[PDB]
Design a protein around this ligand. Structure first.
Ligand SMILES: Nc1ncnc2c1ncn2[C@@H]1O[C@H](COP(=O)(O)OP(=O)(O)O)[C@@H](O)[C@H]1O
Ligand SMILES: Nc1nc(=O)n([C@H]2CCCS2)cc1C#CCNS(=O)(=O)C1CC1
Ligand SMILES: [Mg+2]
Ligand SMILES: [Mg+2]
Length: 281
């Protein structure tokens, strides 16, 4: 039997960099919300203990793909604690709508959906905390997707406090540039001193993304897309870019602006979701 599993995008509704730890990672205060939009992952169990991603993701080698890494991590962890039924395997295919990169968390959402689906399908019985703990080793973006709720996130992104932001409609645009996430976080001029504040202060302050100034300055493609959207609606970078979103109250306004957008916006429209489509499923 084949099962299908949502792998939604996320948005950083705001993103503040509070410092940088010794291991190079940055401490932050950010607010995750999911989008009801993303990839679909299909899984067929194998009985020969193998893991096969049948549908390649362009530019990513099989063994580098977060789908496969997540599956093998779960297999190793379950097997080291006697929770992996003999022969547990899987064929995995993905219908990929999300960009590879851009600050939408698509690869990390793929990792999270695979952890959750395989834990269920192999009957490994691992808890949320254990999965989120294993997800974190695959990237700081992975735990929010594993836990499945919109959340105020601190630490490096793993300290998650569920919250229910307004579920606005978003136009999400992908500038035609690839920004390696290491670039932004290694910039001298990135704010690393933004004062840590309470959720109440943050939820009342205007939402911004501390990384936007740098993405905009360094990538004219990002500045172009942001400048264009800002004429229509509040608009900000998500993640470290390059994607930018514009916030709307209704689907019709968001789609009307989208119908107007030049093709170089590479835009789609989707609704915010405080419960991940994966956990809804
Ligand atoms: N299934 C996957 N989908 C997208 N990217 C992946 C996947 N597996 C590994 N990656 C790697 O991660 C990067 C893009 O990941 P992604 O989570 O989409 O980043 P972003 O937060 O910028 O959206 C690429 O460098 C790619 O090598
Ligand atoms: N806290 C961090 N410090 C860092 O140095 N890095 C770099 C080093 C690894 C890849 S990039 C990432 C994070 C993270 C995170 C949580 N997910 S996130 O908020 O969507 C994304 C916008 C930040
Ligand atoms: Mg989805
Ligand atoms: Mg990611």
């Amino acid at each position: 039997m084949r099962t299908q599993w949502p792998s939604p995008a996320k948005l950083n509704l705001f993103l503040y960099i509070t410092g940088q730890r010794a291991d190079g990672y940055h401490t932050l205060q950010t607010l995750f919300q999911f989008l009801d939009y993303g990839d679909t992952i299909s899984i067929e169990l194998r009985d020969d203990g193998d893991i096969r991603l049948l549908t390649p993701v362009e530019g990513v080698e099989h063994e580098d793909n977060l789908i496969v890494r997540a599956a093998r991590l779960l297999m190793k962890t379950a097997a080291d604690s006697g929770r992996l039924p003999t022969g547990s395997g899987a064929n995995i295919s993905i219908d990929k709508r999300l960009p590879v990169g851009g600050g939408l968390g698509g690869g990390s959402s793929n990792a999270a959906t695979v952890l959750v689906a395989l834990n269920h399908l192999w009957q490994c019985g691992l808890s949320m905390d254990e999965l989120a703990e294993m997800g974190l080793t695959l990237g700081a973006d992975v735990p929010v997707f594993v836990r499945g709720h919109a959340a105020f996130a601190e630490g490096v992104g793993e300290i998650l406090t569920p919250v229910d932001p307004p579920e606005k409609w978003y136009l999400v645009a992908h500038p035609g540039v690839s920004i390696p996430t290491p670039v932004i976080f290694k910039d001298p001029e990135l704010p690393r001193n933004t004062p840590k504040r309470s959720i109440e202060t943050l939820l009342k302050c205007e939402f911004s993304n501390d990384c936007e100034v740098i993405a905009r300055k360094r990538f004219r493609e990002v500045d172009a897309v942001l400048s264009w959207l800002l004429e229509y609606a509040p608009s900000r970078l998500t993640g470290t870019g390059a994607c930018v979103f514009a916030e709307f109250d209704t689907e019709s306004e968001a789609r009307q602006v989208l119908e107007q957008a030049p093709e170089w916006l590479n835009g789609f429209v989707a609704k915010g979701v405080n419960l991940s489509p994966l956990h809804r499923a």
